[PDB]
């Protein structure tokens, strides 16, 4: 099994010893330190993170095939902005070309994960078809002087859609059929993105020096860009389909062929609802929402909330639980003990992975902890509370401490208050010293 | 404080810069044995250049695209030639070998614009030419856009020359042409350097 080892080579290059890191928190201490020597105290050796318990996918409300079936035979390939917009609805997702991928020429997605489109339901998806050549496919991406990169739609980071382009020499013409789509070059009245205003105005009056001195705003050009057919190798066509995926409130009409799995509450799952995916724990709405804000991504670029594609509920999704591994361990001049504080959890869900694993026993090599002490910094496993306190030894936090005093295991044993197994306790502030005002 | 305007220039004579031969797509040949016209004392035609918003390479250094209208030049040379796809790839600096340096390179230090696009006019004389020769080594370190005829050999060897001969024992006299569709990457393209 691929596990990290801290290997020791002698003079000869001969491996004489090694520590298997993903064995016991003590081995993690040594792997963290990069030494076989551990000194008395507490180390951060790793972190525990709950692993996914389920991958929830959803099946459509209506089964049909998506009508992609007419636009790769022969159809309209309008402009680069005005698109052969075909509505996709009421079907089993045929977004499956992104899911298993192709090879593409353009594979740029924003707002949706392309590889999980068969998990993710949509309300409406528009398939926007056009054909463009090499020198124009480059203009999809921002920046670089061009004729379409510099106007209107590029592919912004906040785009809800995927741009799919691949190498095919099938399908030419029919792009120049646009004339009810025109927008300004020179303007005095501003330019709003993607205007369909074919207007009427006339002037010879410029802004900068005009009329014989190569001025600006001396003309009123209008523009709407198509595609040039391939007239030599190098003018290579590519077929581009842009999928505009509606993540907005409405019941889902399109999802993948995979069988519905319903919501699994208070377990770590892989989720993907209304464009919002990630690894997290599903619950239901406690947060206030506007009907226009029924899904959220926070400043951290993670899911905050999402509206459910099949039900009418808004879900609150909080990323899966994790916490520090703080190991209480002595020196290596004495037998080693391992008590682990599982940062900021209760002592009822103490597993490393809850209803999941890391291809290793539920804890790490154990499937149970034992000696579970609920502290004010999390839950301490491998140490039990005793009613015999000290003015601390190894501090844990929040008045909680442990001590190891060659007690033939102290943070690796059950509690006694009648024998030397004085392990973990709330610290005392010394003793009282009697005095009275006189 | 932000600007509201730029300073505008105009030459002292109204003649259009004779960019003619290069425009009418003629006399593109060799890669050193250029058709070079010196352009001076005239009105530039680069407004339309930046506005053509085209080209596979539009690689400028020292001059300013979309601001070329106010940008005056002391000497403009238009050098027209045909080189293959693979040579066009290698125009930018930091190529493989010191043998790339003298194949064709236009450094990022070199001031000018590299205009290259997918046009395939004119095929012959890209190595057929007799005025197309260059040096690899010279004891006075020949640098690009320079040609000469020499009696004297730069001979150093990676293994000492005569009896035993390593690399750089050559008479460093080169020219390379190409024959397209006899392999791949040998497709001609037109390139203009301003």
């Amino acid at each position: 099994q691929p596990r990290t080892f801290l290997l020791k080579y002698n003079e000869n290059g001969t491996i004489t010893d090694a520590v298997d890191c993903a064995l016991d928190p003590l081995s993690e201490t040594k792997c963290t330190l990069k030494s076989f020597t551990v000194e008395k105290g507490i180390y951060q050796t790793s972190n525990f993170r709950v692993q996914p318990t389920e991958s929830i996918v959803r099946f459509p409300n209506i089964t049909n095939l998506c009508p992609f079936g007419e636009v790769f035979n022969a159809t309209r390939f309008a402009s680069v902005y005005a698109w052969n917009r075909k509505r996709i609805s009421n079907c089993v997702a045929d977004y499956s070309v992104l899911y298993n991928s192709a090879s593409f020429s353009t594979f740029k997605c924003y707002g949706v994960s392309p590889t999980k489109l068969n998990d993710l339901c949509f309300t409406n998806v528009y398939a926007d078809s056009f054909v463009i050549r090499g020198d124009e496919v480059r203009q999809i991406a921002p920046g670089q002087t061009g004729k379409i990169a510099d106007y209107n739609y590029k592919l912004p980071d906040d785009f809800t859609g995927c741009v799919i382009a691949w190498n095919s020499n099938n399908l030419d013409s029919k792009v120049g059929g646009n004339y009810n789509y025109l927008y300004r070059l020179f303007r005095k009245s501003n330019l709003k993105p993607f205007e369909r205003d074919i207007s009427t105005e006339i002037y010879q009056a410029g802004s900068t020096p005009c009329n014989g001195v190569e001025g600006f705003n001396c003309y009123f050009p209008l523009q709407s860009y198509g595609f040039q057919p391939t007239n030599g190798v190098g003018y290579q066509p590519y077929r581009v389909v842009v999928l505009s995926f509606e993540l907005l409130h409405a019941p889902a009409t399109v999802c993948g062929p995979k069988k519905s799995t319903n919501l699994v509450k208070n377990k770590c799952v892989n989720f993907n609802f209304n464009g919002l995916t990630g690894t997290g724990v599903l619950t239901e709405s406690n947060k206030k929402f506007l009907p226009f804000q029924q899904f959220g991504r926070d400043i951290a670029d993670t899911t905050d909330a999402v509206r459910d594609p099949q039900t009418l509920e808004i879900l609150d999704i909080t990323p899966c639980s994790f916490g520090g591994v703080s190991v209480i361990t002595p020196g290596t001049n004495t037998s080693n003990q391992v008590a682990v504080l599982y940062q900021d959890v209760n002592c009822t869900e103490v597993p490393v992975a809850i209803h999941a694993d890391q291809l290793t026993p539920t804890w790490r090599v154990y499937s149970t902890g034992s000696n579970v002490f609920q502290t004010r910094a999390g839950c301490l496993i491998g140490a039990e509370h005793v009613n015999n306190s000290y003015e601390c030894d190894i501090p844990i936090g929040a008045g909680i401490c442990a001590s190891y005093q060659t007690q033939t295991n102290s943070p690796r044993a059950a509690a006694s208050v009648a024998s030397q197994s004085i392990i973990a306790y709330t610290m005392s502030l010394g003793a009282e010293n009697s005095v009275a005002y006189s | 404080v932000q600007p509201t305007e730029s300073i505008v220039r105009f030459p002292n004579i109204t003649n259009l810069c004779p960019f003619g031969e290069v425009f009418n797509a003629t006399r593109f040949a060799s890669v050193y044995a250029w058709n070079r016209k010196r352009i001076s004392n005239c009105v530039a035609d680069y407004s339309v250049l930046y506005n053509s918003a085209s080209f596979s390479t539009f690689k400028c250094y020292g001059v300013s695209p979309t601001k070329l209208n106010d940008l005056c030049f002391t000497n403009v040379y238009a050098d027209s030639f045909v080189i293959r796809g693979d040579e066009v790839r290698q125009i930018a600096p930091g190529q493989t070998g010191k043998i790339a340096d003298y194949n064709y390179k236009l450094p990022d230090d070199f001031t000018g614009c590299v205009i290259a696009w997918n046009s395939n006019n004119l095929d012959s004389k890209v190595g057929g030419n007799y005025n197309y020769l260059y040096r690899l080594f010279r004891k006075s370190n020949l640098k690009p856009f320079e040609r000469d005829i020499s009696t004297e050999i730069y001979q150093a060897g990676s293994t000492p020359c005569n009896g035993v001969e390593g690399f750089n024992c050559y008479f460093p006299l080169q020219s390379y042409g190409f024959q397209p569709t006899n392999g791949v990457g040998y497709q001609p393209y037109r390139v203009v350097v301003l």
Partner: nanobody, 119 residues
């Protein structure tokens, strides 16, 4: 853009009209219409005139005037370019292309056409 297809031109007289035809890539074809660029060794390359789709309204610079008209028939989906009230000053090499952008001096758009007026 490049590799524009044109017909017409040659020798015409001052006055009258000359109608040119052109067809082109979606990049040119789909824009306002196709207007005119012209140059001559005694004339700087300039954008002459254009249109904002068919109407009574067309536009032209005061550097070069003429109530030029641009139109599209439906009989054949091409662009007809008509220059009205020509003068000898109009002898130039013409290119029939849309008003945005402009041919580079380091490029050459289609074949072009030559128009000469009364010469």
């Amino acid at each position: 853009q490049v590799q524009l297809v044109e017909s017409g031109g040659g020798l015409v007289q001052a006055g009258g009209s000359l109608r040119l035809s052109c067809a082109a890539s979606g990049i040119i074809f789909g824009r306002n219409a196709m207007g005119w660029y012209r140059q001559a060794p005694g004339k700087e390359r300039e954008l002459v005139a254009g249109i904002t789709r068919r109407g009574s309204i067309t536009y032209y610079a005061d550097s070069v005037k003429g109530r030029f008209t641009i139109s599209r028939d439906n009989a054949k989906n091409t662009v007809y370019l008509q220059m009205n009230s020509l003068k000898p000053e109009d002898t130039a090499v013409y290119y029939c292309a849309a008003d945005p952008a402009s041919p580079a001096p380091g490029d050459y758009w289609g074949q072009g056409t030559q128009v000469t007026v009364s010469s």
